[PDB]
Amino acid sequence: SVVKSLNSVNIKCLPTIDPTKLPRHEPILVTVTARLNKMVSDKLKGYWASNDYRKQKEQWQNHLAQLQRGLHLLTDKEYKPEYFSDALKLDAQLDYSIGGQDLSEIFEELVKRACEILDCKAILITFDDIDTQFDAGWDVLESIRKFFNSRKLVVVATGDLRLYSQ
Amino acid sequence: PEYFSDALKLDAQLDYSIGGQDLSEIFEELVKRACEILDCKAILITFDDIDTQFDAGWDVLESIRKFFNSRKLVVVATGDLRLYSQ
Amino acid sequence: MERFLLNSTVLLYRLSTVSLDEVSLDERVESSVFLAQYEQARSLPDHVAKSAWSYLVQQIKQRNMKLGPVAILRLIAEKFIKNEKGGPKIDLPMFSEWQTLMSRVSCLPIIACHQVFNPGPASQEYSFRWPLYPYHPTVEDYITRECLHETHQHLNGSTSAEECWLDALKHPEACLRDFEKGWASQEMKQLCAQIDPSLTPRIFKDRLQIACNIREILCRVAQGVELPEWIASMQNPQQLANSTILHNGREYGFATVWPIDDKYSQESEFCWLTGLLEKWRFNAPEGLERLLWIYLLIQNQYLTLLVQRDDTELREETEKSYLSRFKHAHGAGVYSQVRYLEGRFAPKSDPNKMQKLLFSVLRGYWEYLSAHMSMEWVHEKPLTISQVLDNLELVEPHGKCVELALVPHFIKRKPKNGEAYPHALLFKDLKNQAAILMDMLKSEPRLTGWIRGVDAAANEMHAPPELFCPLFRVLAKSGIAHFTYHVGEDFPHLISGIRSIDDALRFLPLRNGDRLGHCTAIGITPSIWKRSLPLSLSMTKETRLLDLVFIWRELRSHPELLRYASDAAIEAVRLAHKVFSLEEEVSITTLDQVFEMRGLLAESEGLLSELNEPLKPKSLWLEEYERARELVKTTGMKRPLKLYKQWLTSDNVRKQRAEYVEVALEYLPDEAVVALQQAVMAKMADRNIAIECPPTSNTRISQYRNVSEHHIFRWMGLPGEAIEGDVPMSICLGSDDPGIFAADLKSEFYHLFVVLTRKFGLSPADALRKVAEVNENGRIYRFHDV
């Protein structure tokens, strides 16, 4: 009902996601980036090589490469020492809150860049039931408290709150 | 991934009874050829006891009920059934 | 001087650190050009050099352009590239200079420059994948009738070196690790500082990252779109080392989106570059003009580094790149330009690793057939070894498509000290590697029709050729049925190099129809070999002793070169006392008998292990083990054998062998060395064993002043280059390590044809026949099954 209501300021409605309907080892931030990327790739392909299209897509490809390295440590279980020499990188642009490679400020701009491109003032992420298998719901709870903190994003979850307590 | 492309392979001849991937029906077709070459009406398999190591005897029983189905192969089994029951 | 503005270490340094805004750099490039040309061609006099650079300067002023890549390529494009019926080709008189140029400059920009400024007729659809070849009607029609027959291609890797540059762009992190892993070894450290001392693993990532970012920046200019406004914060190319440029504190980046999906493809680079030079046909902004200069300098630098380093990425590059390789070898047109191709590959110890690569090559070859042989296969998607062989048994050789015959080549290694005999760790790996090959071949016996040959191409001083006798002979019983060796290319002394080939002839189980690789030892004229060498060389005692015993073998037979034979036999006995530390008398006959038994395996029973040992369980090796055992026990003569055990398992003898000795350069007179070389020819021509010839564009010998002096002409029998008394051999054609960037067998075929017509003055009809004999010898001695 919520996604239908907001599909009519303007709040973009993501297709509803659920950790239950996914491979167990799959993270949550990687999915929301994937789920957001398809919703920005569909619009840009609508332009089909316009002057504005090239400028906007150049902004997107530049930013995603920034997220790939910082998140790449989370992709693999063991964190190799080679990342530390590669993890460190001087940059004053994008308003890095803290150095190294941290996704708290990188992903906020990624959410931001969607808003100018999609001409929307808010980003909505809707979830489904995790009562089916709440063991994997911890990574959702960690991602929502770590990489969901921008004033221009809204996140909607559901379920039985006692299972969260459990 | 190499197993994935190893399976799901398209064969149009030999008239497989079961579609997709299956070991039981190809094994029976294999049994057919062995029976005809050795001009026998049927082929007999005789199994021994599992008293010393019946941990593998669980594999013996499953293989019989997984792959030994058709009439052209007949099995002779031995062993105290109460050992099999446990 | 057009070849020093595109491959020059100091110019890259003198332009990378220079900010883009300043333009006055003629005095800095000119100082760089002379310095760079000095460290490359030291023999070029200054007065010629100073005049040459000034001539280039006023030529640009005459053409009314600005000094830079956009102008340098134009002069080369109008110099070398000339349009013809087949499109853009290279003129015959200046083909040889182009091959000299190609060792320093990648051709891809030149064709891109040539196409923009000197396009083809009626803008006919042009697709560039292969390096440019010269046109000659007498030769091009010979290829159409009788296709080329290649013999030595390393399938490990891509087709040429120019596209490997794109792979370095595609895998910046992997190519850094491969360079860093090599940089750990001292040889690469010397080699990198050899090309450029100011090179560090930190710098190599810097240089590659700059090239990638420059590629993105110029692509925006090539697309015609305006710059993304962060070029205001662009002051130095060092900014292009981080992929992140900050302007007014706002986030930015260098990457863009390309019209084609695969930005790192051969087509993408050509469309980018042709588009870029199209928009600079009249004038170019200086800041971006220099940026193109850096990219070409970086591109040539890595290509220069790659070629020398050749004389991880392998796993990623060894999957379905073979289909491109065969398509590259096939060439344009309905029918392939190369019919009989012998692709070599390096076996690996782990059976899963070796099985995976063998399937990839065979599957890749089938994909090449399926694009041409539009005919129904048994399996449409093989995806396994068995279904590939069943599919491949349905094709017939009708002289149009490439025919393949894989040949694994072992890699020799340094002799590890210890383990009771010289190469134990080395032989244990080789024994294991061949064991994986032989059992896997027995698992699928149909592979004997494709796995045809065995080679060993690492070096010569590392492991003597006689070490492969037991491992080859067992492989002969395994069904390989063809043995080739990569022998005689590197040697410490010319007479010693003759011994190495004759070690291969006498010891290796070479049957009639086998081949040898890079027999440079019997090729170089001794007068030519002595050019620019010290008056006394150095070589290991063991290599010296095997020389002295050999020189007695082939010279006492010579009625007039007896003094050398007699002196050698006398002083070889002197050296044997030094090495073996023996006190009794040993004659030259005993020494030869000792050295004729070095082909036996060390671990043969009764030779190194205890004679009374229980019998091993009937391997393919028990024939080898007992054969070296019984003949040692028999003949009633064990005195040479006990000398041989010290030659293998004595602490002092092995140490004395590795101790170096001083040998005069002209130990044998000029005629004396020729006697050995003509003795090899008579022996091997009797055995009828062909010789692989390296590409003549390979300036690896560092002894020939030009191509016209190459030893291949001596073998073929060119008047004025053939030594009297030579026994003509059979010489096949091969292109393994050409030493240049973009090469192919057809280019090598043309290179040989050009030299005969121009330097030696031969008619085109007669010149073709001499080079056609080499191209056909690759077919007479083909390893492909009948």
Side-chain angles (χ1 to χ4, degrees), chain C residues 605-606 611 626 630-631 633-638 641:
Chain C
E605 70 91 18
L611 173 61
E626 183 178 2
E630 168 78 337
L631 71 85
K633 298 160 215 157
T634 58
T635 72
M637 193 67 277
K638 71 187 61 48
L641 204 70

Side-chain angles (χ1 to χ4, degrees), chain B residues 2 5 9-10, chain C residues 381-383 387:
Chain B
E2 59 259 31
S5 282
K9 289 306 297 295
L10 307 172
Chain C
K381 301 167 287 213
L383 276 299
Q387 287 178 57

Side-chain angles (χ1 to χ4, degrees), chain C residues 667-679:
Chain C
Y667 184 13
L668 274 191
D670 291 331
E671 182 65 26
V673 182
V674 175
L676 284 80
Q677 292 200 330
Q678 299 183 356

Side-chain angles (χ1 to χ4, degrees), chain C residues 262-276:
Chain C
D262 62 358
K263 51 193 285 172
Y264 298 146
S265 84
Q266 185 57 267
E267 290 279 5
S268 71
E269 201 91 358
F270 204 53
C271 178
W272 155 66
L273 203 46
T274 45
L276 169 56

